Symmetry: C3
Subunit: 175 residues, 3 copies
């Protein structure tokens, strides 16, 4: 199964959905799905002594304006390996700009993680968590001389609307 | 290749056989094969501060009464990653009951591990190893309020008979 | 996608090319691509207390006299996981003999690693690095009672010629 096209989004979408992990919490390696093959590839090694703050990946059968599936950061107890998928609930949305292009990220929790599965909104999180996440995306390409502006987080309903829209775009631009 | 259906069981089956690893020794993440896609998914994060005592997975082209392929715990020197497979010899069988349902596990060694490849029966193992394994399966779902009873281990020939039966069930219930 | 057959070698071949990693830097597990299925398998656990000095794998759509794709050792900042691929530049060639059979290895860097992407020849590396690499391949099967002779390293152009030849052999012996 191709993890973008063949894996189902999950019956509970857009509220709950599968996430294919590309990058493990704590990693300096920026892995990405290779869209053509469905394999995981090294896009690059980060140019700063920084690491992804949480597991990170994408939602199957979604599509954004950047021609990628929608991105998700998944808060949970444990590191998850690239290429594996998990079930997640959207709890907030982080709008941002990467060199003039929209690049919004979903903030989610794993619904099968007994510690985090009961979160439904990012306002429930310790605020430092949000501060660290925002700072990561403002920092992680600085040493590539690439400009990343991050805006204020939005609530879970904004995230759910983003997911739904990306489902629609995928369904439209398929065949 | 779908790792359940397309990967061969191995010429030496039922005595020696491929094992597709789902969970690495030391992990708190309960990964599982997603039967439909052949991808590895997070089933859950364990609900106790426990970890899998050994690499853990399943045998291709097998089927049990629980509609899953047969489960195998593989004793060896080194952690193995989810989605990779290895060659194993069955050396014992651990019968158990998960909430009233049969859920027996094969105890095996990796035949390509110079340290463990010469084991042919669980009675050859340091007995604590068996004690820790049994205790793990009695413990690991307790905090999910799920009941798991584990019975006395059986010899390698009982394990080989279990494997063979699960080969037969797979061959029957295919097409 | 089958990682040997279906993944492209990369537009820049033979100078720059995809590498599918089989073994992570620091590993004692000798993983290998299973040619038939495209899955990663445990070939064996190394028989000495040694570990791979760098990430290690193969180039898609190549073929050598040993009926395997050509082998590559990839020098870079970070460990890469089995089954993932990356973009690499050939910077040298290590000729060797494994029990009377040719088994030459490419020495490469990851072109997406900001630290190493500017290397074009192995003479640019700290010489100890070459000493450690050579010694690894002279050591790692000793305890299997298998004989491995390693010869003097050759420059990047020798590596590029090896890659190109292995591309040709693959194209010939396909269908
Ligand atoms: Mg993305
Ligand atoms: Mg199972
Ligand atoms: Mg090889």
């Amino acid at each position: 199964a191709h993890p973008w096209h063949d894996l189902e989004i999950g019956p509970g979408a857009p509220q709950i959905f599968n996430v294919v992990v590309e990058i493990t919490k704590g990693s300096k390696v920026k892995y990405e799905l290779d869209k053509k093959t469905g394999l995981i590839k090294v896009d690059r090694i980060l140019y700063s002594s920084v690491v992804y703050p949480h597991n990170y990946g994408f939602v199957p059968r979604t599509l954004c304006e950047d021609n990628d599936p929608i991105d998700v950061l998944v808060i949970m107890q444990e590191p998850v390996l690239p290429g594996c998928f998990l079930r997640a609930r959207a709890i907030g949305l982080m709008p941002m700009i990467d060199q003039g292009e929209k690049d919004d990220k979903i903030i989610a929790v794993c619904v099968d993680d007994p510690e985090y599965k009961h979160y439904t909104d990012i306002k429930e999180l310790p605020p430092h968590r949000l501060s660290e996440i925002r700072r990561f995306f403002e920092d992680y390409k600085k040493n590539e001389n690439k400009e990343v502006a991050v805006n204020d987080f939005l609530p879970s309903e904004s995230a759910v609307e983003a997911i739904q829209y990306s489902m629609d775009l995928y369904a439209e631009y398929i065949l």
